[PDB]
Amino acid sequence: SSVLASCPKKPVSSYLRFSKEQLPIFKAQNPDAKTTELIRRIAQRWRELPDSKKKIYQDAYRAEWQVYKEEISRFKEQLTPSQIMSLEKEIMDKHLKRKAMTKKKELTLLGKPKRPRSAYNVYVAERFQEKLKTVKENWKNLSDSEKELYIQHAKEDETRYHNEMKSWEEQMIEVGRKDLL
Amino acid sequence: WAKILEKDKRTQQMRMQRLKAKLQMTRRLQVEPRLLSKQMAGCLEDCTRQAPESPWEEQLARLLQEAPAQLSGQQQRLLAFFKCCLLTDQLPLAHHLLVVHHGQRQKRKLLTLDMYNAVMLGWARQGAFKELVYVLFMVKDAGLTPDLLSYAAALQCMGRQDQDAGTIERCLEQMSQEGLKLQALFTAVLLSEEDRATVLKAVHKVKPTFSLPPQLPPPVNTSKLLRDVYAKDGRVSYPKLHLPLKTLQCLFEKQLHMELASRVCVVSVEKPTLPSKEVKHARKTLKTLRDQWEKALCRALRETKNRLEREVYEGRFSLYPFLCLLDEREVVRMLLQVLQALPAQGESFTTLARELSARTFSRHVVQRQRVSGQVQALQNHYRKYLCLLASDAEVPEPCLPRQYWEELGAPEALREQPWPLPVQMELGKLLAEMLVQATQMPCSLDKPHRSSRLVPVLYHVYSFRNVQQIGILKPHPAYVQLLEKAAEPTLTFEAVDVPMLCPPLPWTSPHSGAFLLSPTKLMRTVEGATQHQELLETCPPTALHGALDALTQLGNCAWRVNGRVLDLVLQLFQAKGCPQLGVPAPPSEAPQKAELRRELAHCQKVAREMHSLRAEALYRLSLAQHLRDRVFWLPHNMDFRGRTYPCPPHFNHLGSDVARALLEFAQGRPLGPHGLDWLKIHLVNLTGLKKREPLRKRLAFAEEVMDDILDSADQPLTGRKWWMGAEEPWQTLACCMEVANAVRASDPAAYVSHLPVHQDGSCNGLQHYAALGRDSVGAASVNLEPSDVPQDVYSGVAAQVEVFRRQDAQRGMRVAQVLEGFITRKVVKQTVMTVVYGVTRYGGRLQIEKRLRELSDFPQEFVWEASHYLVRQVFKSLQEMFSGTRAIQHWLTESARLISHMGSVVEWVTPLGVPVIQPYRLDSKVKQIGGGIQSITYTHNGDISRKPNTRKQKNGFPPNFIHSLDSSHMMLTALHCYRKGLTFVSVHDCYWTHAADVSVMNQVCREQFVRLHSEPILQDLSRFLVKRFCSEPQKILEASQLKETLQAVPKPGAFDLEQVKRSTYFFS
Amino acid sequence: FKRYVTDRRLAETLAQIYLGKPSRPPHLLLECNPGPGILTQALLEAGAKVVALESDKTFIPHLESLGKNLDGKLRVIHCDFFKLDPRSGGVIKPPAMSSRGLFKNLGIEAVPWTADIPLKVVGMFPSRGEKRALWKLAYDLYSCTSIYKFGRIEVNMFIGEKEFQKLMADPGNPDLYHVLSVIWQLACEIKVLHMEPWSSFDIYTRKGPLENPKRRELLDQLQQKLYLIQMIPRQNLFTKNLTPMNYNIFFHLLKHCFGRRSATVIDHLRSLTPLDARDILMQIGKQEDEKVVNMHPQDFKTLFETIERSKDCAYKWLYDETLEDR
DNA sequence: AAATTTTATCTCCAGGCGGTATGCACTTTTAACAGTCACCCCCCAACTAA
DNA sequence: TTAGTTGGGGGGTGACTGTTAAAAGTGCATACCGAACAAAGATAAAATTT
Ligand SMILES: Nc1nc2c(ncn2[C@@H]2O[C@H](COP(=O)(O)OP(=O)(O)OP(=O)(O)O)[C@@H](O)[C@H]2O)c(=O)[nH]1
C-alpha cells in the first residue's frame, strides 16, 4: 500500500554502500562497460580492501541500524488498523502474484504447448483498446460460413496441439515431472 | 496460418533450448557424489574424465589397497530403509538418498559403515563398477575402513562380471595381507547362497584348489540328566501315527494351501434365519457398500504412494519401500478384513497400529518364501520326512523326529529380519488413517437415497480414564445395525489361529519350527524385546536340544472332537441357552426421573456382558464344528521362563470344561486289566465329591453309584440328571459315557478308549520348596512321604481359620457370625499358595474378595468386612507354618535386590540348560509419533540404557525360579515317557495319558522327580550368580557385599528323596 | 489439614453473614467440622437452629455439653458431609451416612425443585480435595441424587484463591477456562460474600494445634486469601431436552470440547455427532470459524439442546456406556 | 544423615495418555543498493475446454 | 467455473554480479495441564526435605 511506502526501509548493507559510493568513480573510469563486469571489479577490490574500511562501514551500518530500529518502532505504533489491513492484503497479494508468476514461467520454460486458436483471435489478427473497440462491432456476423471456416481452422489447430499434448507428456515423465500430467 | 508457423518454430526452439540445458546442467536422481576432501574430488574428476574405458577395475584395487553403542532412531530408520530398498529392487533411490545425506554436514554424521556396505552389496548384485566405485569414494572420504563384507561384495561383483584373473588375484593378496581370511568371508551372516556361489566361482577362477570345510555329524548332548534320552544303547519303541502315507501327504498339501491363502472361512453355528425381504435388502446394501469401499481404498493407497515417493525425491526418509513390498490388492483385502473384524464398541488407536503392522510382516514373509523358491524344497523335504510318522512306512534306523529331519539334510532356512519398532508403529498408523479417511457410507441406510450427504464409517472419539485421555475408533451405529440385520453365515479366521491339519514342523533351531511358512517365536514376548533371543543364540548349540525335542514331542499329538458332547452343546446353545451349565444364553432373552436410569444402566450392562460371552462361545463352537470329522495338531512354544503353551488361542485344551470335554485322543488303546478302574477313579476325581479319600474308597463310591452313571449316559438331558451336580459337569458326562460303553461291552478288557486321564500334583510349589530345602517336616505335609491318606496344607489352614472364627463369633462379632460355614478350602487356597511367593495383604484381600463375590450365596453387603477379616486371620494363622521355605524365599529375594541395585537384571540357567533373563526395567521417557489424527504414545521396549525396576526384579525372582523348576520336571518326564511308546500331553502340572499307561507314567514321574532333585540346584545357582555378577571388577565393596550375601545359602535338612518313589499320593 | 475458626470478631461477622436474611428467620443451618465450637456458640447466640455434622469424635462431648439445656437448638449428628451416600453399595460405617436416614432423623420433608430453599450448609472445603468435592457435588446436582433429592440446598463454603479463579473463569480469560467452570456456572449462581487471609484461622493437625513458629513462617509462604462463596442452584436448569438422563452426554461433550482447546467447534462436532455440523452452528447463531474458547456456558447448553431437539436422525450421538471405563 | 512424604502391592498366558507451550542449535530464506536490458502483464475487450 | 487465448499501446518485475545480517524454518528436548466423582485398609519400598 501507499502506507507501506510510508514505513521506513532497513539500512543498506556495507558492501552495497561501497558499491554505490564507488560507482561514480567507475563511470569516470569506463562508462561504456557493462555494469555486471563493473560490479565484479568493485567486489574484487572489496575482496582486496583493508579491514579498517570494513570496520568503519560496519560501525556506520550499526548506528544506522539502531536509528532505523527506532523510527520503525515508533512508526508502526501510530498507524491505524485500516492501514494494517491494507498492508496485510497487499503483502498477501504480492506473495500470491510471485507464486503465480513463477508457476507460469516454469510452465513456459518446460515448453508447454499452446491452446487452440479462436475465431476472435483470428478476427483481431485480420484487423491488425483501439482493436477491442473495432472487433466488438465487427463480431456481429451475417455469414454462417465465417463460423464454419473457423471450425475447420479450429479442428486443424486442435489435432496438431493434441498430438503435441500427448507428446509433451512423455518427456515430463522422462524428466520426472509426472505431476504436470 | 503464419501465426501457427511462428508458434511451431518457437516451440521447437524452446524444446531444443530445454534439451541442451538439461544435457549440460525438475527432479532428477543424483548419482555422482560431492566429496569434501579436495584431493578426493580431484581424483573423482580425473577418473571420470580419464578415458571412456576408465580404469574402474583398477581404481577398485587402488581404494582397497590402503585399508588402515545403540543406534539412534533416525539411524535405525535409515538402515531399515536401505535394506528394504535392497529387497524391493529400487536401488537408485537408495543411492540418491545416500549421496544427498553425504552432501550436508549434519546429515553426514548419521551414516555408518553398515549403510555403505548394504548399498555396495546392492550394486554388486548387479555387477556394476561405476556406482560401486562411487560408494567406495564416499566410504573412504567418511574416514571409515573397509571390512570383510566390503571385500566380499567386491569379489561377488568381479565374479558376476566374469572379469579376468589379474584384478581378482590382486585383491586376493591385498585382503590376505590385511589380516582377513577367506574362511571368515564364507561364513558371514548377511550373505545369500547365490552371493556365496558367485564368490566361490570368482575365487576358484584364481585358486581352483581352495575348498570349503567339509560337513561333520551333528553333536549329541552329554548332560547328566539328558544322557539316557540321547543314548543309542537300549530298547526303543517310538510311537507311530495310524494314518497311511498318502493321506498324510494330502493333508500337508491342504495345510500348505490354507497357509498360502492366509485365511480360512468356516460356517456359523448360530440359529439359521429364514430369508425375509429385509435380510435380502440388507445383504444387497452391504455388498454395494463393500464394493465402493474397496475402490476407495485402492485410490487412496495409490495417492499415498505417490505422495510418499515425492517426499523421498526431496532427500527425506519415508515409508515408500515398505508400501511397495506387497501388492495393492493384498493391502486392500487386509484392510477390508480388519474393518469387518471391528467390534461394535470400537478399538483403541494404538491397538489398531500394532495389529495392522503385525499382519503386514507375516504376509511379507510368506511372499518372500513363495518367490524365493523355498516352498518346493520344503514340499520335497516334508514328503520324504513323513516316512517316519506313517504306520505302513518304515525307516532304516528309528530316531527322534528332529534327528531324522536333520539327517535327510534340511533346506537352509532363511527368513526376513524384523523391522525396528518406530517403523512398525508408523506403518500401522498410516494404514489406520488410510482406512479411516477412505471409507464412506450414506447417512440414511434403511431409506434408500432420501439424502445424498455421506458420513464416515469410522469415527475418532476420546475416551477419558481418570485424568488421562485415550483415542478410540468407533463404528457408525447404523453400520452395526446393518451388520446385525444382514446376519451372514460365514466367519473368517486367520490361518495362524486355526489348528494345523498336518503334523507340525519340528523345532530344529530358535528360528524354525511350528507353522510351515508363518513366522513364530520360541519364547513369546512384546514386539521390541530381543534379549531372550540373544541369550538363546549365544548359548552352545547343544544346550536347547532337550527343550526343542520336548516341544516337538508335544506338537506331534493327534486330536479329535467328541461327537455326542458337541451335539448336546449345540442343542442348549441354539435353544435359549443354559447359563448354569456354561452355555451362554441368547441376548434375545434379557432381564430388561433419576430412578429409571439406575435400572436401564444395569440392564444394559448385563446385556453387554451376556453378548460378549455369547460371541466368544460362538467362536469356539463354530471352530469346533468345522473340525468335526478331521484330525488336527496343535503346535507349542514357551514363555520366557520355560512353561509350554499351545499356539492356537481359540480352541485348545487349556480352556473351560466345554473345551476340555470336546477333545479326545485320536489313537486308542486297549483298557487292559486296570483301565476300567482308572476310568472309574478319574470319574470320581472329576466329580469332586471325594477329595480326601484313598483310592479304594473312591473306587467303592464309583461302584456304589453305577446306576446314576448309566442313567446319565443313556438319557443326558431328559433323565435323572445326576451329571449336572459335579464340579466339572461336561467332562463328567463324557467320562460317564465312556464308562457305560466299557461296561456294557462283551469283554471290557479289550475296549478301546480314546479318552485322556489326568493325574495332577498337590501343592506343587511347596513340593519343590521342600525338595530344595530337604525339610522333613515340610516334606511329610506335601505328600513327599509314603502315607495312607492324602494330606494337604490348605484344609489345615481352613480348619484353623474356622476355629478362630468360631472363637470370635462367641464374643459377638457380626461379620464372624454372618459367614458361619462359608469358610472353605476354596477361599484360602490361592492366598496360602502365594504367601511364600511374596503376596502382600492387598493381593490376599483382593483374592478373598473375588472368591466371596463368586460364592453367590454369601450376603454381598459384607464382602469388604469379610475379606478384611479373612485375610487378617489367614496371615495370623500362617505366622509360623513354613520355615525352610521362607528362608529360601528370603535368600532369593535379598540376592535379587542386591543384584538389581547395581543396574543389572537377574539371570539364571535352568538345570536342563535353557537360559532365563528377567525383563523388568524403568521407562523414564515415552515416545510419540506426530501425525494427522493424533500422536500415539508407545513404550520403546528393546532399550538397555533404562535402569532396572528394583521393585519388580525382587518381587518376581522367588515365583519365577520355582516355575522354571516345574517346567524342567515336565520336560524330563515327557522325554522319558516318549521312549516307552506313551502318549503324553501336559498342562503345567497336570499330565494326560491313556487309561492303560497311567501306572507307567506315574513311575516315570516319580523317578524323574528324584533324579532332577538329586542334583544341587541351589549351590549351582549361587556359583553361577557369583561368576556372572559378583566377578565383575567395578567396585570392591559392592562385589564384597554380593559375595557375602550369595555365598551364604540355607543349609540342607534331613530327608532322603528316595522315599518319593513309594509315595502313592505324590501325584493323584 | 483442617482450618477451624477461633477469632471472636470473625465468628460474629460470619454469623451475621450466614444469618443475613431478616425475612424467613428459622433457617436450619447444617454445619461441618465444628472443631472448637466458637462459631457454633456465635450461631446459637443469634437464635438460629444448628445441626453439627462432626467428622471426628475427639471434640464431640464438648459440643454436647455446650448444647445442654438448649431446648433442641443444638443437635449433634456424627457424620461427614463429604462422605454422604457412598457408592460402594455395602453397609454404611458411622463416619458416613445415608442422606435419607439423616434427613428422616432431622425431620426434613422433601419439596419440589421449583419451591423455596429448605436448608443452608455452612462449612469449609477440603484443604487438598477441592477439585474432588466440586466434581462430586456437580454429579449429585445434575442427577438429582443425595441431598439434592430433597430440593435446592445452598452450600456456603470457603475456597482457595487459585481454585476460585479457575471456577469463575470467563471467555475473557482463556487460560483458566475449563469444564468445571462451565458446569458450575450453568448449574448455580455463584456470589462472593466475604474475603479473609489464611492466618485468620488456626491450622489443626492430626496430633493437635500447629503451634510451631517455624511452620508459622512457612504458613506465610502458604498464605492465600480464602474467599467465601454462595451457590444457589438455578430454578430453570432442567428443560425438556436437558434431563437427569442426558447429563452424561453433556459431560462427555464438554470434556471432549476441551480435550483440544485450540480447535474450532465444528472440528469437535465432526467427531461427536453424525448430524450436519454447519446446520447446528447456523441454528445456534454462530459463525463457522468459532473457537471453543469463545463460547459462554449458555452457548454450550444451547448447542446441546439444539443437537438433542433434532428429530431427523434416529442416531444422533456416538457416546455410549462402552466409552466409559475404557 | 535422618527424617518425613509418597507410592505401589507374587508370577505368567505379549502393552503403551493426548495437547500446548517454551527453549535451543542449526540451516535456509529474503531484503537491502547499483545500473543495463529483456520478459510478463496488462487495457480492453472478445470465446471455450480443461 | 476459470483461465488462456490477439491487436497496438502502456508499465511493472526479474534476469543480472555482488556481499551482509536479521528473520524464517527445522528437529529435538522438557514441562505442565487435564488432577471426570464413585468411603474405608495394611506394609515397605522410593522419593523428597531439611
Ligand atoms: N505365583 C503364582 N503361581 C501360581 C498361581 N496359580 C498357580 N500357580 C502355580 O501353579 C501351580 C499349580 O497350581 P494348581 O494346580 O492350581 O494347585 P496346586 O498348588 O498344585 O495344589 P492342588 O490344588 O492341591 O493341586 C502352583 O503350585 C504354583 O506354582 C498364582 O496365582 N500365582
Ligand SMILES: [Mg+2]
Ligand atoms: Mg495341582
